Amino acid sequence: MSIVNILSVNVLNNPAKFSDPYKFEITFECLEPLKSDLEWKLTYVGSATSQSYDQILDTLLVGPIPIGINKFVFEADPPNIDLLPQLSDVLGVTVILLSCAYEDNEFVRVGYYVNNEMEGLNLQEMDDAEIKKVKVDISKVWRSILAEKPRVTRFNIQWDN
Structure with a gap:
């Protein structure tokens, strides 16, 4: 029986520049005291x-x-x-x-797809070889996390049992 349940995840800065830190506001419930800490990644x-x-x-x-x-x-x-x-x-x-x-x-x-686009480039109109040669300017690349479509996977673990 899961001691910790994630109730919501909201991305606070979306879309964002590629190089911006990710800010995930996470709400969860802890049903019982635990011996150890939570390890987020x-x-x-x-x-x-x-x-x-x-x-x-x-x-x-x-x-x-x-x-x-x-x-x-x-x-x-x-x-x-x-x-x-x-x-x-x-x-x-x-x-x-x-x-x-x-x-x-x-x-x-909790998995998300992320669309990444560079200012000035229409990726769908370019062939694959052009994409491998185009000069990318990272300061012009935006990520857009598709945050209304999370993939949530849960793995049974032992907790303190």
Whole structure:
């Protein structure tokens, strides 16, 4: 029986510049006292279905956890563009995963699609080879998290049983 339940997630700065930190306002309930802290993570997934072009963006240990309703803002570092094969990879649809673990075991994951567009570029009118050659100016790239369409996955964990 799940001790911690996420009730809502609101992105506070959306759309935003690619390089802006992510601000996730998270409300959850803790039904029973827990021995340990909550481990929050935000992961950048550079392309759904293919390779692991991924980046853990930030983490936050939150605790001790007050019983009842909890609300906080997880402000996560933006992606590191040096961890990407090349700049143009930031463009188009990518994924972000907000997750929480307890004693090292993930118990909830909230995934979002993210549209990424550069000022002045219409991506749909350009062929793939042009996208791999176009000069990307990261300061002109906006992300738009598709925040009304979360994918919520829950994993049974042991908590303090």
